């Protein structure tokens, strides 16, 4: 709820990161570090309990899914 740096994302297209291939090489309290072993992308969703716009997530799509 910041007007900075605010990458927390909450949404089910968050699954479909997962569903692409997407692995977590990195753990993190809220932060989700995505590695897709094909492509030189790094995804970070941090995932809190909220119900988040995908306003970040269709900006995560342009990494994650191109």
């Known amino acids: 709820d910041r007007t900075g ?3 927390m994302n909450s949404s089910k297209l968050i699954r479909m ?3 692409d291939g997407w ?3 990195r753990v993190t309290g809220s932060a989700h570090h ?3 072993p094909k492509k030189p992308g790094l995804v970070t969703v941090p995932h ?4 988040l716009p995908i306003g970040t997530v269709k900006s995560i799509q342009k990494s994650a899914g191109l």
């Open 5 to 7: 740096s605010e990458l």
């Open 17 to 19: 990161l997962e569903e």
């Open 23 to 25: 692995r977590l090489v």
């Open 34 to 36: 995505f590695k897709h």
């Open 48 to 51: 809190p309990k909220k119900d």
